[PDB]
Swiss-Prot record:
Histone methyltransferase. Methylates 'Lys-79' of histone H3. Nucleosomes are preferred as substrate compared to free histones. Binds to DNA. Changing residue 42 to G: Found in a patient with developmental delay and intellectual disability; uncertain significance. It comes from Homo sapiens (Human). S-adenosyl-L-methionine binds at residues 128-131, 151-160, 178, 214-215. In contrast to other lysine histone methyltransferases, it does not contain a SET domain, suggesting the existence of another mechanism for methylation of lysine residues of histones. Residues 13-322 form the DOT1 domain. The modification Phosphoserine is found at residue 289. This is Histone-lysine N-methyltransferase, H3 lysine-79 specific. Changing residue 92 to M: Found in a patient with developmental delay and intellectual disability; likely pathogenic. The chain holds residues 4 to 332 of 1537 of the full protein.
Amino acid sequence: KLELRLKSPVGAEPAVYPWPLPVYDKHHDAAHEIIETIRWVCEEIPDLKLAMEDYDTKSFESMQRLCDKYNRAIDSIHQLWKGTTQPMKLNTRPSTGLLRHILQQVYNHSVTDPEKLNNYEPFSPEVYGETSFDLVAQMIDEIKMTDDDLFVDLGSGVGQVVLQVAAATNCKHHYGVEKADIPAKYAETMDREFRKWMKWYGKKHAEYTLERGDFLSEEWRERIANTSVIFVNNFAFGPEVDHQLKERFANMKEGGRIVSSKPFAPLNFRINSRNLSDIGTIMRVVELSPLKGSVSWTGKPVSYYLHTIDRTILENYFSSLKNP
Ligand SMILES: Nc1ncnc2c1c(Br)cn2[C@@H]1O[C@H](CSCC[C@H](N)C(=O)O)[C@@H](O)[C@H]1O
């Protein structure tokens, strides 16, 4: 059995690839994953980049040559580290660039038949759609979580939002919960592959768990109440599900935040006597800045919304009713 092997820069088990190298979709294949993996390890380690500084992706010999060259360079670096040279700092977070490649790699090794994710009932709250790496990167940059925070993706799909946030932030725990069998099944493999690849690159992530469950269940009422940052792609959920979610958000703590693809209260909410029980009485809503040149299917640019629990809105309304 012909095989390509890439040694780990930190001495984990080598990544092994069968030949012929498989294709993942029209734009991704294992041959270019190998090449980009070498490239990224070269970014992690300058001396390796230096040692690397005629790739026919369809020729075995030629790809084996690339692999052996990387593998020989990894051995020499490992020897440098037994000398006076300081070994790669371990347990750091991956850069944004590396993380994107890791998630791509993890997805392609896990989501073995992507078409199966489109076998949901259409026009139902089970409609599946993936939030892009770039949006999640923006949210990470703009929300700024600390180790006091708990992060939950409600309806986590195959789990890639949770993996990215877990790789990038120091929340005490990250959760995803997903109800449908197909994506939750894939989420099990995403999880294993993410832990494997992260050890392989020698990078740390914060604690996370991917769960099969229904986030409208009784168990999930208290969990939502105690969550400080909720991510929820509720674009296709519909009004009954969003209403139920509103009822659960009303128990969140001051300063709790929800990032969503459809707003849970209007942006122009003015508290008055008719709307006293509406969820807009206890939260600020703002529209996150669109990322430059990102059109949605509607033609307008992709739109996400940040909600912050803030009951001073309601307290101020009540004091107002005492003072003309
Ligand atoms: N009550 C529930 N309990 C659990 N999951 C649920 C629901 C409901 Br209603 C819908 N969903 C799940 O929400 C996911 C929305 S796509 C966003 C994926 C990822 N977050 C992304 O943003 O890329 C889809 O897998 C539905 O099964």
